[PDB]
Amino acid sequence: NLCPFGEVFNATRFASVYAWNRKRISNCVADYSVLYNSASFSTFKCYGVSPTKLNDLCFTNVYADSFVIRGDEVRQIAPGQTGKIADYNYKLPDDFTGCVIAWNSNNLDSKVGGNYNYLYRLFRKSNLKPFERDISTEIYQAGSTPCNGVEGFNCYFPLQSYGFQPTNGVGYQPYRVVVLSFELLHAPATVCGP
Amino acid sequence: QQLVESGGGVVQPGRSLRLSCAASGFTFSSYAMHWVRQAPGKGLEWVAVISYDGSNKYYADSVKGRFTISRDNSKNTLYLQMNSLRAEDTAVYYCARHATLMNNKDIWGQGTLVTVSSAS
Amino acid sequence: GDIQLTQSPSSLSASVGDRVTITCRASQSISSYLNWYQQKPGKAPKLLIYAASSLQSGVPSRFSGSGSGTDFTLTISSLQPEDFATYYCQQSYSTPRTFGQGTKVEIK
């Protein structure tokens, strides 16, 4: 086969981090060459074993999940850190293998007249379990006064947008972070390079 | 982005009239939604909430007429049936949203006239 | 009981380039949960300030909010010929929500 990296990496519409898209990929072949030959990517790091080594060292079942975050908060995306995106939005595990691929899409996402399509979760009553999204947009009650679904006092709305325009500085530019995560099982290496 | 309302009209008192208001651009589903009232020359008076993210319905006890509120979430639409009418409720209604320190989602419908009178 | 609002003054006929302070007072101590609206009569209420201290898209800093607790302030500055309309404050502290009676800024 071929693995849909032209359908993931050249995709037209990434969701936000409160409802990030996840694509289980297996039973195809890896095009890991042009990943490095792309070289238009801001923050491109890997784990497990070296990025030059991963061309052939291949995988049972990969999880390709992607979202869009801010140009400042992307350092929060690292396996085992803190900050809002890794606290309540999307959680890398304690022991992780995959690569974090990060670049700017300022010419697409941030629009004049304002981009407010994108969102994120700013609060939750616990830190987030690893790789589990949170689409539950109910009201959290920080203080003890029960708001019970409607908004009110001591309680806030869960979600918030980002503010994207091309009037933003370089630190406030939207990154289309796609994260590749890997594993190994009794299952064979169903996705494997040349 | 946009809110549309069911048709207003002249209804005799004591009757009922279901109020439909459909959303567009972004869903009703993730948010709450409200109804407010404007009588001519009178201030904007809040009426009732809806809270889809759990399920709960709060009404103003100032106008406590069991004006029932529920959803059609899959059409991004909301239904409040005008029950136990009385003539001073003759006004225009709005579909509403409140920026509760977090969002900026205050979007308002076009406004339709409910009329409570025996004279058409 | 309910939470009473006190919007003062309920009208103020004004002139070009003014700096009008439309006050919305509260019966209780509300943290910042108060808003402001533009309504020319027959329009939709265009939100002006959220959480009583924060501006809004499309609305420049000719409007400017501040206050907390009971006392809330609409700081209209450099009063523009389009800004003459009927305005409103707003609680979101408890249920029920009430709105102010309105303040019509109008040409002298």
Numbering used by the authors:
A (entry chain A): 334 to 527
B (entry chain H): 2 to 121
C (entry chain L): 0 to 107
What does the paper say about this structure?
During the establishment of SARS-CoV-2 infection, the Spike (S) protein binds to its cellular receptor, angiotensin I converting enzyme 2 (ACE2) via the receptor binding domain (RBD). Like other coronaviruses, the S consists of two subdomains: the N-terminal S1 domain, which possesses the N-terminal domain (NTD) and the C-terminal domain, also named as RBD, and the S2 domain, which is responsible for viral membrane fusion. Similar to other enveloped viruses (e.g., HIV), the S undergoes dramatic conformational changes from a prefusion to a postfusion state enabling fusion of viral and target cell membranes. In contrast to this, P17 binds to the RBM tightly and is therefore capable of blocking the binding of SARS CoV-2 to ACE2 completely by making the binding site unavailable.
